[PDB]
Design an enzyme around this catalytic site. Sequence first.
Site, mmCIF file in Angstrom:
data_model
loop_
_atom_site.group_PDB
_atom_site.id
_atom_site.type_symbol
_atom_site.label_atom_id
_atom_site.label_comp_id
_atom_site.label_asym_id
_atom_site.label_seq_id
_atom_site.Cartn_x
_atom_site.Cartn_y
_atom_site.Cartn_z
ATOM 1 N N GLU A 99 -3.279 13.304 2.907
ATOM 2 C CA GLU A 99 -4.285 12.808 3.899
ATOM 3 C C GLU A 99 -4.796 13.944 4.712
ATOM 4 O OE1 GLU A 99 -2.287 9.209 5.768
ATOM 5 O OE2 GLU A 99 -3.808 8.321 4.376
ATOM 6 N N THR A 133 -3.240 6.179 10.121
ATOM 7 C CA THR A 133 -4.203 6.409 8.970
ATOM 8 C C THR A 133 -4.434 5.194 8.148
ATOM 9 O OG1 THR A 133 -2.543 7.161 7.391
ATOM 10 C CG2 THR A 133 -3.473 8.851 8.872
ATOM 11 N N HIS A 159 0.782 -1.250 0.000
ATOM 12 C CA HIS A 159 0.000 0.000 0.000
ATOM 13 C C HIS A 159 0.798 1.274 0.000
ATOM 14 C CE1 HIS A 159 0.434 0.762 4.317
ATOM 15 N NE2 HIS A 159 0.377 -0.555 4.396
HETATM 16 N N1 LIG Z 1 0.158 6.571 7.898
HETATM 17 S S1 LIG Z 1 0.703 6.687 9.417
HETATM 18 O O1 LIG Z 1 1.891 7.560 9.457
HETATM 19 O O2 LIG Z 1 -0.392 6.992 10.262
HETATM 20 C C1 LIG Z 1 1.297 5.192 10.031
HETATM 21 C C2 LIG Z 1 2.536 5.010 10.715
HETATM 22 C C3 LIG Z 1 2.721 3.705 11.145
HETATM 23 C C4 LIG Z 1 1.724 2.825 10.729
HETATM 24 C C5 LIG Z 1 1.748 1.390 11.043
HETATM 25 C C6 LIG Z 1 0.738 0.479 10.770
HETATM 26 N N2 LIG Z 1 1.236 -0.647 11.354
HETATM 27 C C7 LIG Z 1 0.680 -1.885 11.340
HETATM 28 C C8 LIG Z 1 0.513 -2.634 10.211
HETATM 29 C C9 LIG Z 1 -0.103 -3.873 10.164
HETATM 30 C C10 LIG Z 1 -0.503 -4.507 11.345
HETATM 31 C C11 LIG Z 1 -0.234 -3.870 12.559
HETATM 32 C C12 LIG Z 1 -0.593 -4.464 13.745
HETATM 33 C C13 LIG Z 1 -0.432 -3.817 14.968
HETATM 34 C C14 LIG Z 1 0.148 -2.552 15.017
HETATM 35 C C15 LIG Z 1 0.512 -1.898 13.848
HETATM 36 C C16 LIG Z 1 0.323 -2.523 12.623
HETATM 37 N N3 LIG Z 1 2.455 -0.459 11.970
HETATM 38 N N4 LIG Z 1 2.775 0.860 11.789
HETATM 39 S S2 LIG Z 1 0.553 3.642 9.852
HETATM 40 ZN ZN LIG Z 2 1.158 7.463 6.501
#
Ligand SMILES: NS(=O)(=O)c1ccc(-c2cn(-c3cccc4ccccc34)nn2)s1
Ligand SMILES: [Zn+2]
Length: 257
Positions: free
Chosen positions: A103, A195, A61
């Site tokens: 976003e 997000t 993604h």
């Molecule tokens: N777009 S964002 O900066 O808000 C963002 C920064 C970090 C993200 C992220 C998502 N994660 C995860 C992906 C898939 C499964 C997960 C399970 C538990 C916690 C985080 C998970 N880990 N970091 S999303």
């Molecule tokens: Zn992000």
Amino acid sequence: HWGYGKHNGPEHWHKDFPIAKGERQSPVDIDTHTAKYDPSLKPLSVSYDQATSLRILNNGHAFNVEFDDSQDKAVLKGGPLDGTYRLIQFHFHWGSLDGQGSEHTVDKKKYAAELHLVHWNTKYGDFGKAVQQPDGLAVLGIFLKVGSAKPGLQKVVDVLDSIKTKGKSADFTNFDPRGLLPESLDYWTYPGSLTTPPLLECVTWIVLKEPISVSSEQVLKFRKLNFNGEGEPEELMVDNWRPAQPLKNRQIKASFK
Ligand SMILES: NS(=O)(=O)c1ccc(-c2cn(-c3cccc4ccccc34)nn2)s1
Ligand SMILES: [Zn+2]
Ligand code: NA
């Protein structure tokens, strides 16, 4: 599984992740007229001199540029934050067209893309623990507009052909994320969430006011990536952004007047 399509995009996420409809979701629209200057906020401290990049990964993604976060090397402190937050990765969200892709929005304005520099609060020991805490992460968000090229982005752009599809990665050592920052560190801040699923409400958002400029050719190259894996039908990696969510019972604070 979740993604950005009609059938699995943001309007669907709440079925698997009910906190999609929670009280501190991200992104949000930043109403500049309503955000209040908070003279008690500190200047941010971005200390990236010893950052150690490792790898770049197409995760299906976005692409993540990953850092060695096993010691305090590249840290974010100050601003609204208590304590020390370590850089783990950065990634972008972008559009199919120059007029969309961020976003966060500013007075409902959408930028071409948005950079997220993801940091975790060292008091929680590891990222996995930190994401379970309301003060676990600090994400530095930087808007991208299309104009002149960003020289410090070009090494990123040039490696994308080697990670075209989901699951591919490449060496990405000796990259200096300082070259992605704008001149000013003026910012807005508010409490929010990841997000992307699982949408955890663990982020202190710090959104810089000054966008960076990238060239039309740099963003065009982002759009040649694929959401799919190798050998699968091609689905261009575009419009990988979540729309603005309700602000609810939150204040956005400005570091500047
Ligand atoms: N777009 S964002 O900066 O808000 C963002 C920064 C970090 C993200 C992220 C998502 N994660 C995860 C992906 C898939 C499964 C997960 C399970 C538990 C916690 C985080 C998970 N880990 N970091 S999303
Ligand atoms: Zn992000
Ligand atoms: Na180490």
